[PDB]
Write a protein that binds this DNA or RNA. Sequence first.
RNA 1: AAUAGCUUCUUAGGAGAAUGACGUAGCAUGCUACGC
RNA 2: GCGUAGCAUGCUACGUCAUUCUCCUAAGAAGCUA
Lengths: 186, 596, 596
Amino acid sequence: FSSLPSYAAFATAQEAYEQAVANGDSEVVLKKLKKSLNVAKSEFDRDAAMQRKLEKMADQAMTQMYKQARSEDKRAKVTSAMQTMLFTMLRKLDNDALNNIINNARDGCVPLNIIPLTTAAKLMVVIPDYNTYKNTCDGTTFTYASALWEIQQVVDADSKIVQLSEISMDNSPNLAWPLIVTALRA
Amino acid sequence: AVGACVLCNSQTSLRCGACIRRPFLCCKCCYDHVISTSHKLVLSVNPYVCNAPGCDVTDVTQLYLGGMSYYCKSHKPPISFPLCANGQVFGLYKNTCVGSDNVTDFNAIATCDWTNAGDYILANTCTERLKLFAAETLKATEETFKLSYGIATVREVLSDRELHLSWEVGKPRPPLNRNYVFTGYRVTKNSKVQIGEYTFEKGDYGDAVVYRGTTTYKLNVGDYFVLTSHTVMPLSAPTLVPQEHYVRITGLYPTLNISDEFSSNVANYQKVGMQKYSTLQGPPGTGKSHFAIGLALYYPSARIVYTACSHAAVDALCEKALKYLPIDKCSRIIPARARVECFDKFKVNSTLEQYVFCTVNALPETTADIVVFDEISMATNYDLSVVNARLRAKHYVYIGDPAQLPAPRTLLTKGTLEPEYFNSVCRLMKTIGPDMFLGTCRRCPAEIVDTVSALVYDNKLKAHKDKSAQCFKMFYKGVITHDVSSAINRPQIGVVREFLTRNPAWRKAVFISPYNSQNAVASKILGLPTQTVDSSQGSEYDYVIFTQTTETAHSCNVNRFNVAITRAKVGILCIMSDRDLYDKLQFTSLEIPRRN
Amino acid sequence: AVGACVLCNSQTSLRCGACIRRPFLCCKCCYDHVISTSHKLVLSVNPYVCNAPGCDVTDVTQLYLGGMSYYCKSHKPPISFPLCANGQVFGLYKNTCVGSDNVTDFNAIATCDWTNAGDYILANTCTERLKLFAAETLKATEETFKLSYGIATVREVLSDRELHLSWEVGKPRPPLNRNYVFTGYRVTKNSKVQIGEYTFEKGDYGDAVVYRGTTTYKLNVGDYFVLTSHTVMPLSAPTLVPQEHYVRITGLYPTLNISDEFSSNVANYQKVGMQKYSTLQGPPGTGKSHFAIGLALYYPSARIVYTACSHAAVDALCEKALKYLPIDKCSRIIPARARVECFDKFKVNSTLEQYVFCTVNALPETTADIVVFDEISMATNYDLSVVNARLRAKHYVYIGDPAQLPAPRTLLTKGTLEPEYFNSVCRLMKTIGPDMFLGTCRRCPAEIVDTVSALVYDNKLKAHKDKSAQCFKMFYKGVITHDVSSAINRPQIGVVREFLTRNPAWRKAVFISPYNSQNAVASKILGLPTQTVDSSQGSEYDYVIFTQTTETAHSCNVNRFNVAITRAKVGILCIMSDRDLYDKLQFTSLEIPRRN
RNA sequence: AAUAGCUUCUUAGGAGAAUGACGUAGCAUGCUACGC
RNA sequence: GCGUAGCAUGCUACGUCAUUCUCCUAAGAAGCUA
Ligand SMILES: Nc1ncnc2c1ncn2[C@@H]1O[C@H](COP(=O)(O)OP(=O)(O)O)[C@@H](O)[C@H]1O
Ligand SMILES: Nc1ncnc2c1ncn2[C@@H]1O[C@H](COP(=O)(O)OP(=O)(O)O)[C@@H](O)[C@H]1O
Ligand SMILES: [Mg+2]
Ligand SMILES: [Mg+2]
Ligand SMILES: [Zn+2]
Ligand SMILES: [Zn+2]
Ligand SMILES: [Zn+2]
Ligand SMILES: [Zn+2]
Ligand SMILES: [Zn+2]
Ligand SMILES: [Zn+2]
């Protein structure tokens, strides 16, 4: 604001006007100095308002640029995350048996549920009671979905281990049911 | 899109799209680059072009930021301030931009063309970021130069190895050369398929050329061939890691004693443990790859990588390497490429064994203890940074001798390039030496090592089996009987017309000559096959009849002379004007009209 | 950003910037700290400096609260208020702080430089909160003094473990012992960077030293070693838990008759279970820690923790515990520290073992039934606060003797501290009574304890196992080759020459010496490993070898002689200038060549 | 740690309107110095 | 009768400052209903 050309002209105009008033000449110089300071303050209002607009305009633009950069950064990061998860998921599936059954299918279309139902190598039974235990997965091997599995670890609800001996009709209450028992295809 | 200025490293969002590579520039730095050159377009996180429809002005110096976009001086709204002011163009972090005044050499890079020697000498003598940026830029220029070329239509397909391929109409034919690997195509009508990659060679005559292919899916007469290309990838890693010596073997667990014939090398093998990375100069004929595989054996409990540039170099590497190594090995480079047949021993993707042999341009993401890089008098800035980017090992050694030749690098046409300025590693190998020198050669005759150590070497390498019959019959060169732009020195060949009979035990010798046409016209009236050193550096012979050419500096390059003399077992003859060179090599000089 | 008045416990929002630790001060309390002490930097939620650019009036007495921002008198806002007014300083909760008259003592503790016994003797007897504050500020002060001395550089490169050091001429040099480690900065120009941590050892000759670094870096000539910093965290928990009594035993369960060989202590084994905390004064060489293990048996399943100040002491006691307890015992002392090594038995971090043996520096924050600190004569109020803070148990028992050797207290160079004033626990041990007494020293040659009786003690101890073969050769103190300010009387070891082979069965003694470097010299021309008096105080040995130094004030401390001779079982000799002390020790001394 | 609707409160911004005051220009009227 | 000038007053336009109002946007904290 102070650096505007009107600033110095206005300041020295008011100064010399006060000087001439201390000289006490005829009022025509009073009218002249009034006119001078008037136009000076007019253009001063002009430039002051211009700078006031410029501040807000520049700040809006700058915060806008910050927002744009932020959006682009997050976007690139999320795309990388998605691609990574996709590829690390893919590189897991048992490609052999899957290739087998799909290429066996007459079109390349197979309903989804049978995909795990016939190519999974695991089985996470969940049991809510000793009775359904007795009647689904007794002993060390069992049969389900037309294939032969075998137990390998029986973790209870507290994420502890439970030796296959502990699960007995009289040893029901001490085991915090349900009983997440895994397995393995065989 | 926020990055680091290539000169000020302060966070910024400015790029010169007028520059082919678009590097990040701080405010003041881009100011200096944009005031001085013809680089007259700047792009922020959004382009700085007048938003007014029909206003196609580009440079920011005539632009004012208005409401929420930027306009030319014409369509500007009332409140609108210029984007260039106080040495700052409007962008992010204007108050934290530090900048500098190194604009000079940066501008030199931004304006050069890569067609003169001084360009390269600057490009290999500049700052680090400056170095890598020069690398990327020159590589892109050579990429578009390759792509500036075009097609080649098959006139006839003689055989799986002999070919009649006519080249594009009105086009400067890409020469008969190994590097340019040609991708082929056969359009059905309807989905032209890519028939693979193939390499060519100047055969026994014209027009028919010799060639090799990656696939046995045979070519046709309707196919057309261009050569292959890509897009240049950005780089981050430095050219070379800083030096680090050590007081002991930092985890290098050596062998006990086995293969004591490498005792001449264990003296250096200790030093490998003593330093972080270093160099070694093995002149052709020396214990290289013997040093290397003996080093592998000496430290047998550490993963090792080996690397070179071309398939020829990498198989020459893995050979003599399959020998001293239980196998139990890997050299796994290329799944679906390699115009010439390549590794045929093991898997594709398992990074199985501790020793792998590949090429820099094809390395996958691998970790190991040490990477041994031979062939370094050929490599340039780019491959070094790729190496640092892909292999974070515990040791490194650059193997090789700068006395060999540089790359084709076709764009150099005003001057020549010196080894001390080939690239950084050779600059070190010449400004301080290899720091580790290997002696000595064994294969070549001593008469061609001690006599040739007088030139660029410092008389430090030796050999044996001096005999026999190696003399230089200096013929006074004739006029330039050039058919093609390169000379045909048949007057020089005018010394062999009375020679096919006077060499009793020399019939399977090798005519070699620098000009490809000097091999072709000789192959027309020929008695023995020609192979210039470009296909050599990987090929050995017993005799050789090297024929020089016009007295231009091309023929009398001492580096090419060394690489063309040190490729024989028993025999060599030199035929040149040779006012001074035959004074540094000492044999019985002979004259042409005398048979003695 | 609130807290409690360190003197009045009201909420306050202020701190003294000039005071070293910047403690919270109530309003009037801060007024009094600032009125008559040169400290004038007071920090509120924001600092109190005048916010006028370029105005630096920093005395809080000369500022004014303006509107939103405080200022100086000249730059003051139109209307505002004076800050320091009516004996108060405008701070949050201005009206509701009480403020007290502990002003003089706090002023003293704040301004003092601790170089005279006033600070110790006063912190030993002041208010608990004030006590802890004095402890933290004394630690921080000595830490800041650590910064005063200078840097080390390299002078010449010789080998991997033989270097010549160069002290910055004109600054206090650091003592060459294991307790000093420095980071190695190398200045290229351009990468002034740390290389790793280093520790030194003065070898048999200067200026060569043998040293160890954490890394195997190759030491160049552009390297140097700068001391590594240390800080102090604030502590809140009490030092001495308020005493409590009962009429029954809770949390601990008695035993019937087990281990009758620990009989006499049961009468005190019960009162410990009856009270909240208690102490045992053990005269030198008494049945201390015997009582400890005996109570540990008496209450078997009661979880127990042992702690002390000396690593040698905690090692000795953990070994003695290994001697008689089920194991079933851990000493989680130190994983990767303790330059002089210790246990290699069991875990460091599992928090499962019943009887946890640990050191103050590595105490965890767990619970237990009973914890026992040991050797109270060395630890300080700070250490007391740590050991009371990290743990929490039912009953507390401390065992020690005020007549042992206290902490170093380097800045203490004028005056002396009586046994009582080593810390608060020692104070209570020197109060109306140590409240539990057991005195008889049998692990020592009975004659030496009979002389210890004639020394500062009041002739009240008895023993067995008197004989034999003890004396004191008052050889004249030769030239002290004091590299460090610690003595080296090699001419005194200049008589050890006549005791290297002359002793047929006196071979596995342990050597004691007053100064650290006259122990180092016994570690230079070695006949057996030696230890200092600080490493002593807790172990007894069959024979003892002792070469003293000049009559310096540090040497002639009778308590040191006690804690030295009390480490004997059957043998001892002394080599002291000894103008008078030989008339005090009652044995059969001889001369140099009279050893038959 | 969901979809949707309503409502109380706080801040910033914009826009608009009213009001009052200051200053510049122009328009109208009057009084008067001067000139014809 | 005219103009220059000055003063005073009314009107219009513009450009500043303050008060209020209105609406719209944005952002945030809390509640209720299906
Ligand atoms: N100590 C040695 N004794 C015999 N031959 C050796 C010895 N060292 C190296 N060589 C031989 O040199 C020959 C290969 O040299 P080469 O590897 O062709 O040279 P360069 O590797 O420098 O290009 C091999 O026959 C190799 O055994
Ligand atoms: N009741 C006891 N019977 C036999 N020896 C005892 C008895 N009490 C303590 N001691 C012995 O005192 C010796 C150790 O004393 P020490 O612990 O060296 O003294 P101090 O601990 O005071 O420095 C040990 O051999 C220990 O058994
Ligand atoms: Mg080799
Ligand atoms: Mg003890
Ligand atoms: Zn910059
Ligand atoms: Zn540019
Ligand atoms: Zn425009
Ligand atoms: Zn107080
Ligand atoms: Zn203070
Ligand atoms: Zn001020």
